[PDB]
Amino acid sequence: MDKVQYLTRSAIRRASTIEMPQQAC
């Protein structure tokens, strides 16, 4: 679940890191 939720997040995370910053913390 955490592994599946990790990739799922990396999907939006990668598509949600253009305007605003986002690196782990």
Describe the structure.
- The PDB classes it as membrane protein.
- Keywords: atpase, phosphorylation, phospholamban, membrane protein.
- It forms a monomeric assembly.
- The entry is titled "solution structure of the cytoplasmic domain of phospholamban".
- The protein is phospholamban.
- This protein has 25 residues and is mostly helical.
- Helix content is 44%, strand content 0%.
- It contains 1 helix and no strands.
- It has one helix at 4-14.
- The longest helix is centred in the middle third of the chain and has 11 residues, at 4-14.
- The protein is elongated and about 30 Å long.
- The N and C termini lie far apart (21 Å).
Question: Can you summarize this structure?
Answer:
This protein is mainly α. It has one helix spanning 4-14.
**Separation of the first and last Cα atoms:** 21 Å
Q: What's the alpha carbon Rg, rounded to whole Å?
A: 9 Å
Shape: elongated
Helix/sheet category:
mainly alpha
Percent in strands = under 5%
Order of helices and strands: H
Number of helices: 1
Largest sheet composition: none
Fraction of helical residues: 40-55%
How many β-strand stretches?
0
Topology of helices and strands:
Layout: H1 4-14
PDB class: membrane protein
Keywords: atpase, phosphorylation, phospholamban, membrane protein
Assembly: monomeric
Based on the model shown, name its key terms:
25 residues; mainly alpha; 44% helix; elongated; membrane protein; atpase; phosphorylation; monomeric; phospholamban
